[PDB]
Curated annotation (Swiss-Prot):
Name listed for the protein in its UniProt record: Endolysin
Recorded GO MF terms: lysozyme activity
GO cellular component, one term: host cell cytoplasm
Family from the record: Belongs to the glycosyl hydrolase 24 family.
Organism whose genome encodes this protein: Enterobacteria phage T4
Active site, per annotation: 23, 32
Entry keywords, A to Z: Antimicrobial, Bacteriolytic enzyme, Cytolysis, Glycosidase, Host cell lysis by virus, Host cytoplasm, Hydrolase, Viral release from host cell
Amino acid sequence: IPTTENLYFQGSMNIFEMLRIDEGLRLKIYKDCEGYYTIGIGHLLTKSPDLNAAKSELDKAIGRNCNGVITKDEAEKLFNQDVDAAVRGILRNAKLKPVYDSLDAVRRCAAINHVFQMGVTGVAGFTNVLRMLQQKRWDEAAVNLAKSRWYNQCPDRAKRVITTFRTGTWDAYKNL
């Protein structure tokens, strides 16, 4: 039985806290599970193997000379920008918006997370999953998500998102 504290947990979770868990928080340029230069909270700098391109993109995104290092406040501002971009990317897209609209609040967070991670065209190409979600076929959607390269090449970053699509609860984010 959920305790009073347990019942409060869902109000502490939102898309920012969700992606923060999946992406982590790093103040220095690093390589993600696919070897792509990344910083902050899952901000992909470039797909280039050239660290110099990544640092260039960094200074562009932050607006100062960073030399590969940012502050927590800066990470958070960039993260906020990226979350907004993912939400906007869903809402303007004729394929993703109807699916998003059909989902409950927690699965909506999973959708924004999915888009943040894969980008709009990658997600919008998941024809079967999108249909399953619209039809509330949660088990099937989750099994199909678990076939994707997105999940399989980097399972720890995607696994909680898939669980959340399956359940529409925050359970995968409890007890880290």
